[PDB]
Every structure is written in C-alpha cells, then in structure tokens.
Amino acid sequence: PKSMQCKVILLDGSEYTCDVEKRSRGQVLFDKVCEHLNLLEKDYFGLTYRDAENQKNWLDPAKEIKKQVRSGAWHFSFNVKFYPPDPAQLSEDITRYYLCLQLRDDIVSGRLPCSFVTLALLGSYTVQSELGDYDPDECGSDYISEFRFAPNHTKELEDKVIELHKSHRGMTPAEAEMHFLENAKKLSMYGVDLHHAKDSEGVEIMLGVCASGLLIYRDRLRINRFAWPKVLKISYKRNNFYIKIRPGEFEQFESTIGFKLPNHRAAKRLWKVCVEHHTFFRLL
C-alpha cells in the first residue's frame, strides 16, 4: 500500500508531516491534521494548496488528493474556511484559538484591514493570551514585540499595544482570545474572501464571499450586497460567473447577474466557494 508524504503549514507557522495512501481523499489528510491539532469543531476549517497557476485552492475532502494537486507538490496549509459570525457560540476554546491564529495572519497579510486602534487592541489581547500580565522588565521605552501585529509596524503601534496590554492584568488566555474575536468579528472585511472580476461592462470590481452573502465592491461609493436567501442559483460558464437573484415581491421574473473572471479556473473556484458558503450559512 503506497503512501505519499504530506507537508501541512499550521496556523502557528510550524510544519506537520504525515503519510497517506496515494489514492486518499482529502478528508483522510484533514482528519490526521485535526487530530494532531486536538480540534473537534473541524467544520469551520480546511486545507488549501497552491495550483499550477499558483492560486490558493481548497482541498476537496470528498475527492482524491492526487486529482487535485495533480502535477504539484503534496504541500498544504491549514486554514479557516468558514469564519463563524459569532465566535462566542463555538463550543471549544481551542477552536477560538485557531480562529485567532488565522485572523492574526489575515491582519498581518493585509487581507483584513484594521484601524490603528483596532490593530493595537487586537495586538494587546494576543500579547495578554501569549505572555500573560504586563511585565515592565520585558519592555523599556524602546520595546518592540516579537509578535507581528500589522501589515506595517511603527513604534507608535508598539507603544499602543503596551499601553492596552497594561489594562488587561489578570485576563486568562481564553478570555483574551474571546475579546480578540469580539473585536475582529466586527471589522467590515471579517471572513470576506475577495475575488477579482469585471462586471458586464468590463469595469474591474471585487466579489466578496462571506457568511451573510455575496458582496460587490464597485468603487468606494456603491457596494452591492446579496444576502444568501436572495440567491437561488450560482453558475459558471467559460470565464463567466452568474448568480440567479430571487424575484422581489410582486416581480414576475428572477434576475441573472453576470461577471467576467480572469480564466475558467477562477470562475469555477468562485462558483465552488459561493455554493459552499450558501450551504454553510443555510445550516446556521
């Protein structure tokens, strides 16, 4: 029984290595990673890989790993797939912990834009969780933390993290992680998966996929949003992605809205994430 070596980047940046049988479905690897992580609330998470065109793709747990990674390395990342809109309702602290690690990388990467004060507050909870109570011994007026907090670090931001960290004395890790999540969940790009597209006129937009629905980001002014209940069918054809919007009250006809994606693979990818997010949110 021939086995392939898998390397998984975990959310703390460490590498987990394991072997699966070469005809294994994605679920087999995912189960091994989740057992390694002592993660029970596995439904929110998934594995990604980097494809032939080097995009991020979700590893389909129901399909053979080899028919997905195809010519590529058996190298994966462990990620949040479905961002819980209310993380306080998760059953385990360890689930909230992994969601915090993902969100830290969402922030440092610039996928999750954040004001100065929110960056500092999120940072202060992370430090409280990781090091415990503020210690002046490990921080002079020139202190710079080992923690990555933001896409661009400043001395100002480091100072503000420390000032807020002082206020959290006696906060336990689970408590600080819950406060981190209570702030993060409110950010306008929380759990929003952004896809580059063009509208039916060739104008560059972004489509955002999230719990509440599909978002369009035309230009600063005019952000369209389609709550999942308003979406009856999602489809793709060639480089095009279509959503069938439910008929408004007293309207005779459903309405179809069309987008141009960079290529066929990008249209299929957007279709699949939309279908998955509609099902997820429908079972909330």
Footprint on this chain of ligand NVD (rule: CB under 6 A): 26-27, 30, 43, 46-47, 61, 81
**Nearest to ligand NVD of 175, 276 (CB atom):** 276
**Nearest to ligand NVD of 165, 278 (CB atom):** 278
Please give the Cα distance from 140 to 99 (Å, whole number).
Answer: 31
**Nearest to ligand NVD of 76, 125 (CB atom):** 76
Q: Find the shortest distance in angstroms from Cβ 91 to ligand NVD.
A: 13
**Nearest to ligand NVD of 49, 149 (CB atom):** 49
Q: Find the shortest distance in angstroms from Cβ 45 to ligand NVD.
A: 6
Q: Find the shortest distance in angstroms from Cβ 86 to ligand NVD.
A: 16
Q: Of how many residues is the chain composed? A: 284
Among candidate residues 175, 158, 210, 172, the one with its CA nearest the CA of residue 189: 210
**Nearest to ligand NVD of 96, 278 (CB atom):** 278
CA torsion, points 77, 78, 82, 86, in degrees to nearest 10?
-140
Q: Find the shortest distance in angstroms from Cβ 32 to ligand NVD.
A: 11
**Nearest to ligand NVD of 33, 103 (CB atom):** 33
Q: Find the shortest distance in angstroms from Cβ 165 to ligand NVD.
A: 35
Pull the structure tokens for residue 121.
């507050």
**Nearest to ligand NVD of 78, 180 (CB atom):** 78
Q: Find the shortest distance in angstroms from Cβ 214 to ligand NVD.
A: 19
Among candidate residues 265, 206, 270, 237, the one with its CA nearest the CA of residue 53: 265
Please give the Cα distance from 187 to 110 (Å, whole number).
Answer: 13
Q: Find the shortest distance in angstroms from Cβ 191 to ligand NVD.
A: 15
